[PDB]
Amino acid sequence: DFEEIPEEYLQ
Amino acid sequence: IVEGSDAEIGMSPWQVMLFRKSPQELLCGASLISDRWVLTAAHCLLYPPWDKNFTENDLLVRIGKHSRTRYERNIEKISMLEKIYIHPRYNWRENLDRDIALMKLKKPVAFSDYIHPVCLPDRETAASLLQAGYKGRVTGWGNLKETWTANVGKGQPSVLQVVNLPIVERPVCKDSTRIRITDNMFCAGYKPDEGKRGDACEGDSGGPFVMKSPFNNRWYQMGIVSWGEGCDRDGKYGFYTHVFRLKKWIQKVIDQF
Amino acid sequence: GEADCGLRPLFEKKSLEDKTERELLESYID
Ligand SMILES: N=C(N)N1CCC[C@@H](CNC(=O)C[C@H](NS(=O)(=O)c2ccc3ccccc3c2)C(=O)N(CC(=O)O)Cc2ccccc2)C1
Ligand SMILES: *[C@@H]1O[C@H](CO)[C@@H](O)[C@H](O)[C@H]1NC(C)=O
Ligand code: NA
């Protein structure tokens, strides 16, 4: 249930 | 954190979240000690029996957070890891002895009102403050109960939690557990006869046990949330890595690397 | 000299105290 973070950090 | 309460904004500016990339989940707490170094528990990263062995690429560090789940765009900073260092004589085989690990950030973080490092203790501070009956503070986004009813009970906190716990006499710590406890550990929590409660719980691990010095007004990290038997059980105590006893290793790693 | 640490911008640095730190300090004087 995390808000999504910039996908640059998730590769 | 069991039987704690909501933190105030900016009450623990050194609190770090260890975030797993995929799946997205909360791994452990940690603490900021300079602009490029983070301190946590070894067992958050490495435990061979459950084939647990995380890597610089497996994780994100999130600094400056209040909410457990929000992306706090204005306030938090997200960093990648350059390198992880685990104490070479970390004993995962029998008692989690030397449960400590350092993490070097890829880039330095800019401090702000919500991001600030905690002090590590010198010999004089450690000797004055680490005494049975004195209280420290634990913070984290870990569980609010050991166990709860699925899809009804709560659960996990929505903001950072805080509890204050007393340090306990070495003899009582020993008597309370069949585990071989070393001089790299201390235990804290209330005794059954005292009428207050409180403990760390799943997800609080790796986070800081801190104390405030009345003479210079500074906060010192004396411990790291390490292990315990359940959460907030009567006649049981949480065990913490003894940060001062292990300061020479910290000192070596930061100086050499 | 030594880098600043353990003084929170929104507390120590503005002379405000958090809700429960008084509990920590009193533990010292029993
Ligand atoms: N009450 C507390 N303050 N703590 C610290 C925060 C997590 C709490 C709940 N977590 C647990 O109750 C699970 C397990 N306990 S245990 O009694 O099974 C236990 C105790 C000591 C042990 C020493 C060596 C090997 C196994 C041991 C297992 C454990 O501590 N942890 C740590 C945790 O929850 O982070 C699980 C764990 C142990 C070792 C490696 C990975 C995970 C316990
Ligand atoms: C864990 O993984 C790292 C990097 O892949 C490796 O070098 C290390 O030996 C591993 N350790 C264990 C105990 O599996
Ligand atoms: Na207890």
Q: What is the 3-state secondary structure (H, E, C) of chain B?
A: CECCEECCCCCCCCEEEEEECCCCEEEEEEEECCCCEEEECHHHCEEHHHCEECCHHHEEEEECCCECCCCCCCCCEEEEEEEEEECCCCECCCCCECCCEEEEECCCCCCCCCCCCCECCCHHHHHHHCCCCCEEEEEECCCCCCCCCCCCCCCCCCECEEEEEEECCHHHHHHCCCCCCCCCEEEECCCHHHCCCCECCCCCCCCEEEEECCCCCCEEEEEEEEECCCCCCCCCCEEEEECHHHHHHHHHHHHHC
Domain covering B13-117+245-256 in this structure, CATH number: 2.40.10.10
> Closest-lying ligand to the alpha carbon of B98?
1
DSSP assignment letter at C18:
-
The domain in which residue C4 lies consists of: 1-30
Residue B75's contacts (CB-CB under 8 Å, 6 or more residues apart) are B64, B65, B66, B112, B114
Contact between B44 and B221 (Cβ < 8 Å): no
The closest of B242, B198, B253 to B220, measured between CA atoms, is B242
User: CATH 2.40.10.10 in chain B, residues?
Assistant: 1-12+118-244, 13-117+245-256
> Closest-lying ligand to the alpha carbon of B197?
3
Contact between B139 and B2 (Cβ < 8 Å): no
Q: Which of C8, C18, C19 sits opposite B116 (nearest CB)?
A: C8
Would you call C4 helix, strand, or coil by DSSP? coil
Angstrom distance (rounded) from CA B133 to CA B166:
5
User: What atom in ligand 1 is closest to the CA of residue B200?
Assistant: 3
Which tokens hold the place of B88? 């070479």
Domain spanning B1-12+118-244: which superfamily? Trypsin-like serine proteases (2.40.10.10)
**So which residues of B are the catalytic ones?**
43, 99, 205
Ligand 1 contacts CB of residue B97 (under 6 A): no
Number of domains in chain C: 1
Q: How was this structure determined?
A: X-ray
Output the CA–CA distances (angstroms, integers) from residue B155 to B142, B148, B164, in the order listed: 9, 7, 21
Q: Which of B116, B133, B137 sits opposite C9 (nearest CB)?
A: B116
CATH number of the CATH domain containing C13: 4.10.140.10
